[PDB]
Each structure stands twice: as C-alpha cells, then as structure tokens.
Amino acid sequence: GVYDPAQARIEAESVKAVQEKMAGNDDPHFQTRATVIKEQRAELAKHHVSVLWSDYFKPPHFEKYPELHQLVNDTLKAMSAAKGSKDPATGQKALDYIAQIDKIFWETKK
Amino acid sequence: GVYDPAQARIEAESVKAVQEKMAGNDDPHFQTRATVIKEQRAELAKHHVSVLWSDYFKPPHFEKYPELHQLVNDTLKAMSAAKGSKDPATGQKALDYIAQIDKIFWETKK
Amino acid sequence: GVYDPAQARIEAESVKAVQEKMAGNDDPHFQTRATVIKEQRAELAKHHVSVLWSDYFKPPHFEKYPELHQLVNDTLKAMSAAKGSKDPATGQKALDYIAQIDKIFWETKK
Amino acid sequence: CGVYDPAQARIEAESVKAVQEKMAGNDDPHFQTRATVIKEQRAELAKHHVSVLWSDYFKPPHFEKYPELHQLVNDTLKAMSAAKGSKDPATGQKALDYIAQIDKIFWETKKA
Amino acid sequence: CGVYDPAQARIEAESVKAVQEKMAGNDDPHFQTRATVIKEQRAELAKHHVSVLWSDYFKPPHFEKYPELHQLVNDTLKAMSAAKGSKDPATGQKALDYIAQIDKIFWETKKA
Amino acid sequence: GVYDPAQARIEAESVKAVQEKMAGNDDPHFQTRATVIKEQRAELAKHHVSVLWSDYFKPPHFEKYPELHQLVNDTLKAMSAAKGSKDPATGQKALDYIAQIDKIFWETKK
C-alpha cells in the first residue's frame, strides 16, 4: 500500500486544463465532452484526497496538525466547486489546497 | 442530490453478515469468495461515509458538532479494520459508528 | 445476503431530484452536469432493481406473485424512460413502480 | 443506441467455465485465489449483459410472443449465480445452455 | 482464462457509430448530451478491448509474423479517440475498418 | 491533456509493496486480501501504461523511438506476470520497464 498526493494533483491538474480549454471553444459537442471529462476527473481527485485522509493519516497526525481535518474537507469542497464551474480559478484554488496536504504528507513521511 | 447514511449501513451490514458466514464454513473456495465480497462491500461503505462528510456536511455542522470530523475518520478506520478481519465484532463496531453519524445526520435535517 | 429496495429507491429519488433541479436552473453547464449525474444514478437504480429480482426473489415468490416478473421489467423500463427525460413525473413513475416492489419484498420478509 | 448482442453474455460465461476448468489443473493457492477473483467479476458481468437484454432490448410484444422469456432470463441469472459459487465446470455449462436459449429467441426477433 | 474475441471491441465501436448516426436525426439538447455521454463511455470500452487483445492475447511470435500489428493497434486506438471527439459517422466507420483488420489477423492466429 | 507515467509507477509500486508484504505474513485471510488488492492495482497500472501509448505518444515519437511499441507491450506483459505472482522481483521488472517509458516520456517533454 503506497500513498502519494500526486494522484490527487494529477487529476486536479486535468480539471484545470479542461476548464482552460472550455474558454477557447464555442462548439456544443466539445463543451459537453469537456464537462463529462471534468466531472469524472474531479470525482477521482476527490477519491484520492479521501483515501489519504481515511487510510494514510493516523491519530498522531491529527494531533500534530489540528487543522488537517478541516483542510481536507475544504479541499473536497474546493474540488466540488471546480466540478461545477468552467472558471480556471476554481480549479487552481483546489490545487492550492492539495499543495497544503502534499506539504503535510511529506512532513509525516520524514 | 439525495443523501442517506442507510447506504453506508446496508453495505456495512453485508460486511458483518459475510463475517458471520465465514465462521460456519471451512471450504477454501467459499472463504475466498466471502473475502472478495467483504473487500468490495467494505470499500463501498467507506465511499458512502466519505461522500456524506465531503458533500452533505457543511461548515455549520462541523461547528455545531466539533467531534464530527473525528467521528467520520474513526468510522472509516473501523470499516478498514472490519475489511481486514473475519471477526463479526469488528463489523458490529463499524455499524455502531455509522449509527452515531446517522443520528447526527437526521438532527441536521430537522 | 442483505437486501433492501431502499438502495433502488434512494438512487431513483436522486434521479427525480436532479429532474426537479433541471426545471428551475437554465444554465447550459448545469444542465449538462445534471444529465451526466442523472444517467449514472438511473443506471445504479436499474442495477439494484435487477439484483433483487435475480438474487433475492426465489421460485416460491414468483409462484405467489405471478405479475412480479412483468412488474420488474416495467420498473426497469420506466427507469430507462426517466434516464432519457427531464420531466420529474417520469422519475415519479419509476418510484411508484419501486414502491410496488418494496411492498412485495416486505411481505416476503414476514 | 440499439446495438445489442447475446455474444457479450456468452463470452463472459465462457470465461467463467474456462476458469472453472483451469482450477482443476493447478493446485497453487495463489492461482486458486486469482481464479476465484476473476470468476466473480466475469460472472457478474455475464449477469449484467443478460439483464440488459431483458430490460433494454426485449420489448413488450416479445413477452407476449414468448411467455417463457421472463422465467428463462431469471433461471439464466440464477444459473450464473450458481456458477459464481462453484468450481465445477458443469455449472458453467448450465449457464451457457440457458444463454443459448436466450440467443435463439434473440435472433428470431431480429428476423420477424 | 484464455477466452478472447474482437467482437467485444467491434460491438462497442458499432455502438459509437450508431450513436453518431442518431445525433444527426434528433436535435433535442438533452438527447445530444445523453448521446455524448454514452459515446464517451462506449468509445473508452472499445479502446479497453482492443488494448486487451494486444497485451493479453497476442504473444511475441505474433508480432514477428505480423510486424505491422503494433502500429495497426495504435492506429485503431487513435481512430477510436477521433470517433470519441466527433459526431460524424465516418469517424466511427474508420475505427470499425481498423478493428476489421485486427479481427482478420486474430482468426489467422486461431488457425495456425 | 495532462499525462504523467507517475500514475503507472505508483500503482506498480503498490503491486511490488503488496508482494513484499505477502512474503512476511503467513495468514490465509491476509494472503487472499492481498491477492485481490494486487489484481486491481496491476490492472490499473496496465490501464495507465496503455493510455500513454494510445493518447500521449504520437507518430513522430514512434519514428524517433522504433522500439517504443514493443517496450510498451513488454511492460504490459511484465505487469500481467506480476499480477500472477507473489515474487517482488516480478513487480520490480514491471517497474524497470515503466522507468524506460518514463525516460522516453520526459525526453519528449523537452
């Protein structure tokens, strides 16, 4: 059982990249396809963030970082906001939150 | 978007029912099949508990119930313990934790 | 095994709830996202209805309730009609059919 | 869409029977377990395809023309569930026999 | 297991082309969206089946006997990706044409 | 689109880690659970390797690296061999092959 927040980051990066491409194309088919892919990719990023909190992070980590529980919840809600938006900024906000989890993850691995 | 912890409870009930049936049969094939089904069912219960915490529960719920973040994490770890055990008691412990989430869920719906 | 038509009902209620929301929100992005969600929720509802018919209901139940076979086929088709529609009444027709299966299910539990 | 074929159900059921046959040859505990995992997934996929034909392809007049179809499909699904829980190739064959009966009715509905 | 068949790839690719054809008839925004969702899922499943044949069925001497197979399979997958992004039935047909070429090589490996 | 062989590497590392754990824990229940986990992790690794070959790598990359087609087929087969084995060396062979794809991938990003 190997863990890495890179899995959440890669899927969230895809969400932002899809949002950016939606602003440069008018086509109803492309807009629909991009919305389908974004939905799937965002749900996968949420799954990876959830698994880290559920299976990797243990009681001493929640004691050492009392803000971790809320950070992970805020990340999931940021990803949910990105899932329902075409705005690349919401995709970036989700990535900013994942970056904070990534920092904490590696501090617990040292 | 409808939510109900019954989805987590039904899948966790299946996990306990599978654990109980493992004590009454010696057969290597049945033991293997039951282990495969238990793994799948436990992961589904974990997914349903995760979705409630991620998508249903909002900031005022975490403020009103300061123990909710840790209750949900303890539930996931209890389900993970049940996933790796043949003991029906570990399956019951997971159900006891889901019952506490179910009580809080309905209090937020009133 | 542990069975309950509540699994089918919850997914079917989600389909109707998505249909209700589509009626009051004109946004093309939301309309597309709602269509993706409705498609998978209806497919999940169909899975649950199918499982009860194949795995729970045995030959004595089909003998006592001769219309059960056709009721389940009608329910599945009503769910496919709901999957292809934005109208809440189609989601309600599928829920009315699940309510008929739910009634029969509990009579066999007594 | 409109593109359905019992071959999807048959291929997955053939895989179930093929796995049951391979289990009798190799006694290795790891292979026995891997085979059980694959059989479980393949059997549920065979069940999905059979159920899809019954609900999505077959229409109401097909059930009037073939009053046995409802019961035949249920027996196929139960036969597949029996195969899922067994290492015996005979159970996998029973599921294939039932699928062969659905296949016959399918191609008749394609002609008239 | 040992039970493989290009029909699985073909049926899913036929569903992709059938959806592309249905999109030209009904202009309803809800149907256009539902069709796009189904096409995306069906196209990825067609890609999975083609990739499985290439890695799990086809063995090393098959690539010596058919030096074009590696490139043919990649072109099939790319043709399917093109169909996934288009409403045009001609793209779905191109994917089926490539699958027909894989199908021919498959049945030759079953004979000798 | 956003691609990275890290997705294939992480799943492949999980396969090797499960193989390592199977070597030091005799329990039949754990052995079965580990086999289920290893089976899906290897299948996910195969999916990722296949996606890079079909969706990322284009005709100029196959022209510049003539052995890339066979390298990817060998990697997928090594992963299937790892899926059917408890030996960590098979998991490592699949990781060595992914490392060769990773090297080529980054050279095309420059």
**What does the DSSP assignment read for A73-97?**
HHHHHHHHHHHT---HHHHHHHHHH
Residue of A73, A77, A79 to mutate for B, most B C-beta atoms under 10 A: A73
Torsion angle of the four alpha carbons D38, D43, D49, D55, in this order, in degrees rounded to the nearest 10: -140
Contact A53, B64 (CB under 8 A): no
Q: How many residues does chain A have?
A: 110
Task: Tell me how far apart the alpha carbons of residues A20 and F9 are, in angstroms, rounded to a whole number.
Answer: 28
Q: How far is C29 from chain A (nearest CA, A)?
A: 7
CA C62 to chain centre: 20
- Environment class of C2 (CB within 10 Å of its CB; exposed 0-12, middle 13-18, buried 19+): middle
CB atoms near residue E1 (< 10 Å): 16
Residue F4 zone, left/alpha/beta (φ > 0; ψ -120 to 50; rest): beta
From residue E48, alpha-carbon distances to E41, E42, E90, F51 in Å are 11, 10, 21, 10
User: Could you tell me where the DSSP H helices lie in A5-87?
Assistant: 6-22, 28-51, 59-64, 68-83
User: Using H for helix, E for strand and C for coil, what is the string for E12-74?
Assistant: HHHHHHHHHHHHCCCCCHHHHHHHHHHHHHHHHHHHHHHHHHHHHHCCHHHHHHCCCHHHHHH
| Residue among D105, D106, D89 nearest D23 (CA) | D89
**Sequence-separated (6 or more) residues with CB below 8 Å from residue D48:** C47
Residues on B contacting C at a C-beta cutoff of 8 Å: 1-2, 4, 6-7, 10, 13-14, 17
Instruction: Give the chain F residue nearest A21 (alpha carbons).
Output: F1
Contact D33 B32 (CB under 8 A): yes
DSSP D24: T
Structure-block tokens of residue F82: 């790892």
List the resolution, Å. 2.0
DSSP B66: T
Contact A55, A6 (CB under 8 A): no
**Helix, coil or strand: residue D59:** coil
Q: What residues of D are designated binding site?
A: 1
Task: Tell me how far apart the alpha carbons of residues E7 and E13 are, in angstroms, rounded to a whole number.
Answer: 10
Instruction: Give the chain A residue nearest C37 (alpha carbons).
Output: A39
Q: How far is B14 from chain D (nearest CA, A)?
A: 17
Residue written as tokens 């047909």? Answer: E93
- Environment class of D98 (CB within 10 Å of its CB; exposed 0-12, middle 13-18, buried 19+): buried
Q: How many residues does chain B have?
A: 110
Q: How many residues does chain C have?
A: 110
**Sequence-separated (6 or more) residues with CB below 8 Å from residue D110:** none
Query: What's chain C's Rg over C-alpha atoms?
Result: 15
List all chains that touch chain F, counting a touch as 3 or more CB pairs closer than 8 Å: A, B, D, E
Contact C45, C5 (CB under 8 A): no
Chain F residues with CB under 8 Å of D45 CB are none
Residue of D26, D27, D33 to mutate for B, most B C-beta atoms under 10 A: D33
CB atoms near residue A107 (< 10 Å): 11
C-alpha torsion sign, points E18, E21, E25, E27: positive
Task: Tell me how far apart the alpha carbons of residues E43 and C8 are, in angstroms, rounded to a whole number.
Answer: 28
Contact E36 A32 (CB under 8 A): yes
Q: Give the number of B-D residue pairs with CB atoms closer than 8 Å.
A: 18
DSSP F53: I
For chain D, the straight-line distance linking the first and the last C-alpha, in angstroms and rounded, comes to 20
Q: How far is A24 from chain B (nearest CA, A)?
A: 30
Contact B53 A69 (CB under 8 A): no
Chain C residues with CB under 8 Å of D47 CB are 54
Contact E16, E42 (CB under 8 A): yes
Contact E3 D22 (CB under 8 A): no
CB atoms near residue A57 (< 10 Å): 22
CATH topology of domain D1-112: Four Helix Bundle (Hemerythrin (Met), subunit A) (1.20.120)
| Residue among F30, F3, F42, F21 nearest F86 (CA) | F21
Contact D1 E8 (CB under 8 A): no
Angle between helices E89-109 and E7-23 (to 10 degrees): 170
Task: Tell me how far apart the alpha carbons of residues B39 and D37 are, in angstroms, rounded to a whole number.
Answer: 11
Contact D37 B37 (CB under 8 A): no
Chain E residues with CB under 8 Å of A37 CB are 40
Contact A61, B39 (CB under 8 A): no
Contact B85, B19 (CB under 8 A): yes
- Environment class of D2 (CB within 10 Å of its CB; exposed 0-12, middle 13-18, buried 19+): exposed
Q: How far is A87 from chain E (nearest CA, A)?
A: 21
Residue written as tokens 């290492």? Answer: D87
Contact C84 E31 (CB under 8 A): yes
Residue of B18, B25, B36, B90 to mutate for F, most F C-beta atoms under 10 A: B36
CA contacts within 13 A on the Cβ side of C36? 23
Task: Tell me how far apart the alpha carbons of residues E15 and D84 are, in angstroms, rounded to a whole number.
Answer: 29
Structure-block tokens of residue A68: 């971790």
From residue F110, alpha-carbon distances to A13, A36, F107 in Å are 19, 31, 5
CA contacts within 13 A on the Cβ side of E10? 16
Q: What residues of E are designated binding site for Ni(2+)?
A: 1
**Helix, coil or strand: residue C2:** coil
Q: Quick one: CATH architecture of A1-110?
A: Up-down Bundle (1.20)
Structure-block tokens of residue D56: 């999505």
For chain F, the straight-line distance linking the first and the last C-alpha, in angstroms and rounded, comes to 16
Angle between helices C68-83 and D69-84 (to 10 degrees): 90
> What are the residue ranges spanned by the domains of chain C?
1-110
Structure-block tokens of residue F19: 């193989």
Task: Tell me how far apart the alpha carbons of residues E12 and E83 are, in angstroms, rounded to a whole number.
Answer: 12
Give the method of determination. X-ray
Residue written as tokens 């053939």? Answer: D14
Residues on C contacting E at a C-beta cutoff of 8 Å: 31-32, 35-36, 39, 83-86
In terms of C-beta distances under 8 Å and separation of at least 24 residues, what long-range contacts does B101-110 make, across chains too?
A: B101/B5, B101/B8, B101/B49, B101/B52, B101/B71, B101/B72, B101/B75, B102/B5, B102/B6, B102/B9, B104/B61, B104/B65, B104/B68, B104/B71, B105/B3, B105/B4, B105/B5, B105/B52, B105/B56, B108/B57, B108/B61, B108/B64
| Helix %, strand %, coil % of chain C (to 5) | 80, 0, 20
Contact D14, E51 (CB under 8 A): no
Q: Which amino acid is at E23?
A: M
DSSP A54: I
Task: Tell me how far apart the alpha carbons of residues A29 and F71 are, in angstroms, rounded to a whole number.
Answer: 36
Vertex C81, ends C80 and C83: CA angle to 5°?
60
Contact A7 F2 (CB under 8 A): no
Task: Tell me how far apart the alpha carbons of residues E39 and E47 are, in angstroms, rounded to a whole number.
Answer: 12
Contact F94, F82 (CB under 8 A): yes
| Residue among F2, F25, F12 nearest F96 (CA) | F12
| Residue among A77, A91, A100 nearest A41 (CA) | A91
| Residue among F77, A67, C53, B91 nearest D70 (CA) | C53
Contact D70, D55 (CB under 8 A): no
Q: Which amino acid is at B80?
A: S
Contact D11, E9 (CB under 8 A): no
Task: Tell me how far apart the alpha carbons of residues B43 and C59 are, in angstroms, rounded to a whole number.
Answer: 32
What is the helix (H) or strand (E) element at residue D19, kind and residue range?
helix D7-23
Structure-block tokens of residue F75: 């990697």
Task: Tell me how far apart the alpha carbons of residues C86 and C65 are, in angstroms, rounded to a whole number.
Answer: 33
User: Could you tell me where the DSSP H helices lie in B1-110?
Assistant: 6-22, 28-51, 59-64, 68-83, 88-109
Task: Tell me how far apart the alpha carbons of residues A32 and B48 are, in angstroms, rounded to a whole number.
Answer: 28
Residues on D contacting E at a C-beta cutoff of 8 Å: 1-3, 5, 7-8, 11, 14-15, 18-19, 22, 38, 42
- Environment class of A89 (CB within 10 Å of its CB; exposed 0-12, middle 13-18, buried 19+): exposed
Torsions phi, psi for A5 (to 5 deg) = -70, -5
Residue C31 zone, left/alpha/beta (φ > 0; ψ -120 to 50; rest): alpha
Instruction: Give the chain E residue nearest C33 (alpha carbons).
Output: E33
User: Could you tell me where the DSSP H helices lie in chain F?
Assistant: 6-23, 28-51, 59-64, 68-83, 88-108
Q: What residues of D are designated binding site for Ni(2+)?
A: 1
CB atoms near residue F30 (< 10 Å): 14
In terms of C-beta distances under 8 Å and separation of at least 24 residues, what long-range contacts does F92-95 make, across chains too?
A: F92/F16, F94/F12, F94/F15, F94/F16, F94/F42, F94/F45, F95/F9, F95/F12, F95/F13, F95/F16
Structure-block tokens of residue C8: 């089918």
